Design a protein around this ligand. Structure first.
Ligand SMILES: COc1cc2cc(c1OC)OCC[C@H](C)n1cc(nn1)CCCCOC(=O)[C@@H]1CCCCN1C(=O)[C@H]2C1CCCCC1
Length: 126
């Protein structure tokens, strides 16, 4: 399934090249501006523990956050910074770039790998 495909084919977008955040572009976006630290970012997403979703669509609204401000897991600050408006991307994320050994119960156990599909809807500078 889609997590395994990211394992096999995804790009390592970590600075350390530790395969902590792996990415596949599923639909190409437009623009050649990507988000930068500080921007207010609007996305839809579906996420799950890699072993099989929480979705923004379950709440009938986009998920909104400020990029690079630690309002989200590290993997999202790294990954969304690579995305163009209109892009749909898949991320597979090791615990070091998500919730680590502590986890975040009840939704996330210790040492969890996470999978997201993210659509970047829009972004605006602070
Ligand atoms: C660990 O807690 C959660 C994790 C995740 C979703 C969570 C969540 O809270 C309980 O509820 C989403 C809906 C509530 C109303 N909420 C929380 C936040 N914004 N809205 C702020 C959430 C900040 C933490 O989440 C994240 O950084 C990432 C990336 C942004 C979307 C949510 N996300 C998650 O890790 C998801 C998680 C839920 C279980 C399956 C894997 C994805």
């Amino acid at each position: 399934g889609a997590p395994a495909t990211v394992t096999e084919q995804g790009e390592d977008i970590t600075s350390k090249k530790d395969r902590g955040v792996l990415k596949i572009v599923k639909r190409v976006g437009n623009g050649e501006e990507t988000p930068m630290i500080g921007d207010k970012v609007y996305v839809h997403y579906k996420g799950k523990l890699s072993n099989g979703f929480d979705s923004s669509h379950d709440r009938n609204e986009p998920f909104v956050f400020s990029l690079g401000k630690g309002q989200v897991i590290k993997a999202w600050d790294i990954g969304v910074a690579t995305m163009k408006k209109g892009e749909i991307a898949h991320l597979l994320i090791k615990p070091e770039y998500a919730y680590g050994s502590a986890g975040s119960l009840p939704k996330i156990p210790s040492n969890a790998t996470l999978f997201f599909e993210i659509e970047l809807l829009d972004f605006k500078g602070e």
